[PDB]
Amino acid sequence: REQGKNAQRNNIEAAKAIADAVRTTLGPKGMDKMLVDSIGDIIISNDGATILKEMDVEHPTAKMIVEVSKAQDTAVGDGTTTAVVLSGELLKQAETLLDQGVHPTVISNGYRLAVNEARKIIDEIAEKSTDDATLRKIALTALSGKNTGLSNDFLADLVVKAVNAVAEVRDGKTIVDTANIKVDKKNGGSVNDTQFISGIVIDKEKVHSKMPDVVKNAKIALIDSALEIKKTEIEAKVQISDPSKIQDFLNQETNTFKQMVEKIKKSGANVVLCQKGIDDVAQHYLAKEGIYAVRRVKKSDMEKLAKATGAKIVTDLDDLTPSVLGEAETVEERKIGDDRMTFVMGCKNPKAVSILIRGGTDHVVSEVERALNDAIRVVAITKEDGKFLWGGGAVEAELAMRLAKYANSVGGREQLAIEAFAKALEIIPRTLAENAGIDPINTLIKLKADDEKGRISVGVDLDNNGVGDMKAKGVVDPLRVKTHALESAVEVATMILRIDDVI
Template sequence: MLNGQMPIFILKEGTSRDQGKNAQKNNIDAAKAIAEAVRTTLGPKGMDKMLVDSIGDIIISNDGATILKEMDVDHPTAKMIVEVAKSQDTAVGDGTTTSVVLAGEFLKQAEELLEQGVHPTVIANGYRLAVNQAKKELDAIAKDVKDDKSLEQVARTALSGKNIGLGGDMLYKLIVKAVNAVAEEKNHKFTVEPSSIKIDKKSGGSVNETELIMGLVIDKEKVHSKMPSVVNDAKIALIDSALEIKKTEIEAKVQISDPSKIQDFLDQEVDTFKEMVSKIKKSGANVVLCQKGIDDIAQHYLAKEGIYAVRRVKKSDMEKLAKATGAKLVTNLDDLSASYLGSAKKVEEKKIGDDRMTFVTGCSNPKAVSILIRGGTEHVVSEIERALNDAIRVVAITKEDGKILPGGGAVESELSLRIRSYAASVGGREQLAIDAFAKALEVIPRTLAENAGMDPINTLIQLKAEHEKKNINTGINFSDNKVSDMYAIGVFDPLKVKRHALESAVEVATMILRIDDVIASKKSAPSPGGQGGMGGMGGMGGMPPY
């Protein structure tokens, strides 16, 4: 009540409001809780999470983005942290757990400064100065990728810790082969489109049976049993229209008064299909992959001509087939000619598990390839698929960027040291925030050590000692549970992944720090008589009068 006047309520009934330090504490606690949820999954010895959804479906994964996507997060600040993982996953495909753990730690360190009376804007400015300096230092530490061996080590590091059974050594070589196959070089710079690598999965069999096909696998069988199961020296036609008689746009009825005309009508339909098949045969095609349907009569005549045909192939697969075989998509059969056909050494139908699939193999210089994943159970196969998707993206950006960093917490340990010395040169209150940033970076080697069952304090002391001696590539060796040179044991991280993880973690941390008021509205139930809740002006959910 102000000067004896009635209180003025400006927000809807049921609206809750947190202000000042209380709002900041709630937000930071929510962010720390999300970071804590995924922290144990970090590194090659990280643990997995089992996620069970409302209908009982199970996902077992240690991929940060997958875990956070499947968690039913309700708190608005926690949702912002989940967005960090999504953004990291979309941009570079890996480092999702790192970015979330860093964001949580930046906020934890900021909380201590807030309690000492440092203003949130000062902390935000300090963090921005620190991340800009960190990016410069990353560029200085990074080394060039020399050969495929380095790319294999990048893939190996990305796959380490994923639940992929015994096939890891074979998988990272397979990933590099796939990326090299679809990479295109222009002006001595590579561009890689990860979507050109198609991943198919079939449970049953062993992880070691996972294979790279220099061509494409389509999860479809031939449309007619009389068609050949194997076509050598395949000439492939990609047709994106239906091999069916089109229905008219307007409703029409055909009345036949003379019974003898019925057969003529049916013959005419058959002739139409015969003509379609003869156009295909004339072009020289012996394999037809159709995006839409193929009529039963057309199937019969295609089988008669010994042409292998598949129908209802996905549009994305048609585009990849064009890249793999060199074929051009045809909409009108009249346009089909030898120049539109693609080629492959072999097209065959194979039974994989319980399903029949079409394999297009032996393409010369394919710009789209397939990886067929095998594994004991559906859950194993799904986790391998997630791991491969991450590793393919990581190898692709390393191929494009050509820069790598030492892994195993070596980069964070070195950055922490360099940012501390940079803080001294800045001075002022921002120096406190830059120091906090440097301290927060140590969460990565500390967590890696914890997850590997090592003593985190001793490990950090050893890392600091080595980095002070200018051994900038020293990180945690998980094979022997000690610190050693990461380049010597082949543990590499791509520069782009680290840079993006730091940027996105700082962005979300500074955004959360600057929030000092959380106003959450709730939908109020309509009051009796349909007056839109006018009757409840009294209790405004703790709202102060203005």
């Protein structure tokens, strides 16, 4: 247990420590962290949410900052590192005020005033556009400091392409369910080998060799149960008194499997995707009848496939009518890398696509997938909101300048807290300077001037070695992620700032 000053200085110190752990992942020039456990093992990522979710944080106050990795609205791209780094700075800047004699609650009030204002300023300054070109700029920016190679423009295009494929319009507004975009990976090298498929890709091979390699004009049956011998619930025991019965019993089984397959054939299905197992005898007769079957299909895939093909997931084969069958032009098995995967294409519903990522190393295809997923999210959000913000610390610099003025229009104590919040925002542009290896102090000096001359879009430029126009370089941040990164930071900093005793 710790009380008062000792409790607070300690909590702040903890918050700062965890922020430092992710700090260097910020931006185009972000570094990676290698996280190693005991059994599973090594994870190498630049993703802040991944790093924090995996980290073995001990301290309670640090366990609280780490919780930002789970706020779905913030934990996408650099949102996580931005929220954590900012909480750290908000707590650090507070320490000074606590030292002067300012009460933790007025500091909390200042931050609330500041963040509410900032949330207003950014909706004011938010740039509108649903331009596919801007979408591409969102993705390019999202893929910036990752180990993806040079294929970024190629990836960015895939993203926009996938997003625009499943994006739909409800009452006047564009809604994009990312769950309709199936992303999967396979170790084959190249990356440029990533494919965009108009259908659902399934990491599953056909159960039996004699089954067709490709089915055209497919009537697809999605099945919930196992195509195996089922025993009754109330215990059952078979008693044979006639030696002749043994064969008959052995045959009822065969005939049971024969009927299963008859039911399936009767519905017109020519493809059977089973969520469970399929007995070898059933596989025998399915192949005999020419039906293409896959077994032990993931529920997630079962659901996406029902979505894409219009098929109803059926459990009782007796309810396997032609009404519950899905449709697709082609169901084909084809070898990808070293595996054989099933491709369901030309589905009844066009709003379903897949991205088969390639890249070799394994530990790269994973982050690349990790990357493509964030990219898909950010591009999806923007597609919806239609608004974005300038990157490279441009937003923070504007905010820092405005709040510095808004502080003056506020009363004594709160004013101090609001000037502290304004300083805290500079931790972002400074972090990008430091990471790129440029002089932090002078970049800030320049950045401040330009945004004050009205150059809203001037962020930190690695190239120009200092500040530069993000409008030209195309570095754009989605809005939603910004506002939530600020809000998360404030809510969490306040929670921690208010504690005066840890027992």
